[PDB]
Amino acid sequence: GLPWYRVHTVVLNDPGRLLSVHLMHTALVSGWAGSMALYELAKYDPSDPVLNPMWRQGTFVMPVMTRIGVTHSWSGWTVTGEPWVTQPGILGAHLNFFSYEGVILMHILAAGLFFLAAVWHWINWDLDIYYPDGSSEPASDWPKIFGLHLLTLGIVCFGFGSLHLTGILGPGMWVSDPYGLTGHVQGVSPDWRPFAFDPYNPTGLVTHHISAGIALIIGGIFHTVSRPSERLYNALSMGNVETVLSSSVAFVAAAAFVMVGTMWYGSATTPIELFGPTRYQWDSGYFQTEIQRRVQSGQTWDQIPEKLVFYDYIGNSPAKGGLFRTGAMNSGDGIARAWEGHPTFTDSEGRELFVRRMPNFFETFPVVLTDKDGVVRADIPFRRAESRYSFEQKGVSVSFEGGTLNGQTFTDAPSVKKYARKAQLGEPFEFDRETLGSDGVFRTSTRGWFAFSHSCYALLFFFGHWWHGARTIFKDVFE
C-alpha cells in the first residue's frame, strides 16, 4: 500500500474526488472561522473599549472582521464606544444583520453547504464532464480553468474595491487618526496620484483593488481565450496539475511573507485600534513624543486622552511576550483599570531627573534615574550592594500629575522604588491580577501572534514549493 505520507495521491488522477477534497477543506476552513469567532464572542468584555480593547483580550479574528465593517453585536454593544443605533432602516441596510453573530451564522451555514457538496462530489466521481469527447482517461485543461478562476476572482476583487470599500454599497473600512483615538468604519475614495502608494494611507487600498481588479479581469479574459505556447507548455508541464500545486504554494508563501511584513511594520490594513501598537512605536518614542508635545502645547496633564497614554505602556508592545506564555495579555500583567498619572522625580537638591525607559530587548533593566543633561543622579543598586549614588542616600520624592495619584507626593523609599520601576516600564497604571490569576509576566498582542505564526508558515511553505517543483520537473524520474 501507499506510505502514510502519500495517502492523498489517490485523488491525483481523479478530478472529481480532487474537487471533493478541496470542497471538504473549504468546509473545514469556514467552520473554523465561525467557531473561532463564536468563542471570541463568548469570551469578551465590551464594557471597556479604552483600557481593555480587543487586542488586549486575546482576540484573533475579531480585528480581522472589524477591519472592513463589522463592529456591533446583536446584544447591542459596538466596539467603537457607543451602543449601536439601528441606523439601518431600509433594504441595503442589512447592517443590523451582519453583526458578529450574523457573520458567524453565515460562515457555519457555508461550512455545512460545502460539506454537503463535498460528499456529493465524492460519491459522483465519474461525471461525464471530467472525460473528454472520446477518451476514457479524465483530462482537464488547466490553462483555461485558470482563466475562468482568475476572471471570477477579478470580478470579485473589482466589486470589493469599488462597492464595499468606497462605501457606495458597503460599510467601507476602518480608518483612524495617527494616534489611534477615533476609529470609524467609513468609505474611502480612490485617487491615482502617487501618494496612494503610501502604505499607511487607506486611499491606496481602494485604488489598488479597483485597478488590480480590472487587471485580473483582463488577465482572466486573455487566459480564458489564449492557448499556451509549446515552449512554455512543455517546459512547465502544463498538462500536469503538480505544476499548479508548486506555483500556487510558492505564491501563497510569498503572500504570507508580505502579510507578515505589513503586520509587523504596521500599515493602513493593520490599524493599532484593532491589532494594537507595533514594536517600533515604542522604540521611536512615538506616543511619548506626541504626549510630551501635547502637554507642552499648554494642555494640562489630566487632560491627556487615556488611549494615548495606554499606548505608551511597554506592556502593550508585541516584542515583550514569549513563545509559551499563553492566552490573552490580561492573563499577563493583568487588566488595567486606571492611570496613576504622570510621575516626576526629584532628588535632595531639587533637580528634576528622569528614569530611562527599558528598551524592547531587555527582559529586565537596571533602574537608573539620570539628570536630563546625561549625568546619572540616582539609581537602585543591584539586589544587595553598597552604593554611592543610591535611592535613599540621596533621597528622592515623586509627584504625580493627573490620574489616580494626582497631586500626591510619595517620599517613602519603597513607594518611590515601586513607582520608579513602573516609570521605567512606561506609564504607571492600575493593574488587576486577582480576577484572572495573572502571572505578571507579559504576553504578546494579536499582532505578534500573527507575525510569528505566519512567518513560520511562509518558511515551511517555501520548502513545500521546492519539493513540489522538484516532483513536477523530475516527473519521469519520480516513479
Ligand X SMILES: CCCCCCCCCCCCCCCCCC(=O)OC[C@H](CO[C@@H]1O[C@H](CO)[C@H](O)[C@H](O)[C@H]1O)OC(=O)CCCCCCCCCCCCCCCCC
Ligand Y SMILES: CC1=CCCC(C)(C)[C@H]1/C=C/C(C)=C/C=C/C(C)=C/C=C/C=C(C)/C=C/C=C(C)/C=C/C1=C(C)CCCC1(C)C
Q: For residues 111 and 127, give the distance between their C-alpha atoms in angstroms, rounded to a whole number.
A: 24
Give residues 5-64 in contact with ligand LHG (rule: CB under 6 A).
5
Q: Is the Cβ–Cβ distance between 114 and 26 less than 8 Å?
A: yes
- Joined together, the cell numbers standing for residue 122 give 465524492
Binding mask 153-192 toward ligand CL7 (x if CB under 6 A, else -) reads: ----------------------------------------
Give residues 258-317 in contact with another protein (rule: CB under 8 A).
264-266, 268, 279-281, 283, 286
Among 4, 195, 324, 361, binds ligand LHG (CB under 6 A): 4
Q: What is the DSSP string of 145-205?
A: HHHHHHHHHHHHHHHIIIIIITSSSS--EEEE-TTS--EEEE------SGGGG-TTSTHHH
Q: Which does 50 bind (CB under 5 to 8 A by kind): ligand Y, ligand X, ligand CL7, none?
A: none
Give residues 282-341 in contact with ligand CL7 (rule: CB under 6 A).
323-324, 326-328
With cell 471530467, the residue in question is 130
What's the burial of 165, exposed, middle or buried (CB within 10 Å: 0-12/13-18/19+)? Answer: buried
Q: For residues 308 and 320, give the distance between their C-alpha atoms in angstroms, rounded to a whole number.
A: 19
Residue 453 contacts ligand CL7 per CB under 6 A: yes
Alpha helices, DSSP H only, in 266-382?
272-275, 280-283, 286-296, 306-310
Residue 16 contacts ligand X per CB under 6 A: no
Q: Is the Cβ–Cβ distance between 104 and 44 less than 8 Å?
A: no
Residue 459 contacts ligand CL7 per CB under 6 A: no
The residue at minimum Cβ distance from ligand Y is: 112
Q: For residues 358 and 352, give the distance between their C-alpha atoms in angstroms, rounded to a whole number.
A: 19
Contacts of 464 (CB under 8 A, 6+ apart): 249, 253
Contacts of 317 (CB under 8 A, 6+ apart): 277, 279, 282, 360
Q: Which does 58 bind (CB under 5 to 8 A by kind): ligand LHG, ligand X, another protein, none?
A: ligand X
Binding mask 211-250 toward ligand CL7 (x if CB under 6 A, else -) reads: ----------x-----------------------x---x-
Residue 3 contacts ligand LHG per CB under 6 A: yes
Q: Which stretch binds another protein (CB under 8 A): 58-66, 308-316, 320-328, 412-420?
A: 320-328
| Shorter beta-carbon distance to another protein: residue 11 or 252 | 11
Q: For residues 289 and 12, give the distance between their C-alpha atoms in angstroms, rounded to a whole number.
A: 59
Contacts of 397 (CB under 8 A, 6+ apart): 345, 346, 409, 410, 411, 416
| Shorter beta-carbon distance to ligand X: residue 56 or 307 | 56
Binding mask 106-125 toward ligand CL7 (x if CB under 6 A, else -) reads: --------------------
Binding mask 151-190 toward another protein (x if CB under 8 A, else -) reads: ------------------------xxxx-----x-x----
Q: Which does 344 bind (CB under 5 to 8 A by kind): ligand LHG, ligand Y, another protein, none?
A: none
- Grouping H, G, I as helix, E, B as strand and the rest as coil, residue 381 is coil
| Shorter beta-carbon distance to ligand Y: residue 110 or 215 | 110
Q: What is the DSSP string of 95-121?
A: GGT-SHHHHHHHHHHHHHHHHHHHHHH
Give residues 31-50 in contact with ligand CL7 (rule: CB under 6 A).
39-40
Residue ranges in contact with ligand LHG by CB under 6 A = 3-5
Residue ranges in contact with ligand CL7 by CB under 6 A = 4-9, 39-40, 58, 60, 221, 245, 249, 323-324, 326-328, 446, 449, 453, 460-461, 463-464, 467, 471
